[PDB]
DNA sequence: CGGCTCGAGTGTTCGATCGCGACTGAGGACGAACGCGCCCCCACCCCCTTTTATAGGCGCCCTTC
């Protein structure tokens, strides 16, 4: 879903994404929705997180939300 | 002793720039199919000699104006 390749977005959930810094206000928003919605459907295993020791608080709750 | 107001340094897609390469039509230069025609090889059968007997056609050379 990052660096711009979208590789079938219907089909698969094995992904690899980047937390959730994809989620601008006004500027990304169908962008951002149609990743939330879809995933929340076809998707809902395993949350492997790496190096979550400089990540703040603020962005995990848009993590366990989107 | 407790809250709140700038500055400096990261992160991230995604707004804004402008070089290079795909597509397609016209012009210049070179190679291939087929073009021309002297030279050369094999096959068929003409050229040339001599002696006998006859005689028309016509060239060469002594002599005269």
Same mark, same amino acid.
């Given at each position: 879903f990052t660096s711009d390749a979208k590789?079938? @977005?219907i089909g698969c959930s094995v992904? *690899?994404?980047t937390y959730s810094m994809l989620?601008?206000?006004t500027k990304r928003s169908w962008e951002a929705e149609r990743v939330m919605e879809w995933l929340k459907t076809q998707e809902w295993g395993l949350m492997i997180l790496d190096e979550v020791?400089? *990540? @703040?608080a603020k962005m995990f709750r848009?993590?366990?939300t989107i």
């Amino acid at each position: 879903f990052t660096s711009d390749a979208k590789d079938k @977005p219907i089909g698969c959930s094995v992904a *690899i994404s980047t937390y959730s810094m994809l989620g601008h206000t006004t500027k990304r928003s169908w962008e951002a929705e149609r990743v939330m919605e879809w995933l929340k459907t076809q998707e809902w295993g395993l949350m492997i997180l790496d190096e979550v020791h400089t *990540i @703040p608080a603020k962005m995990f709750r848009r993590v366990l939300t989107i």
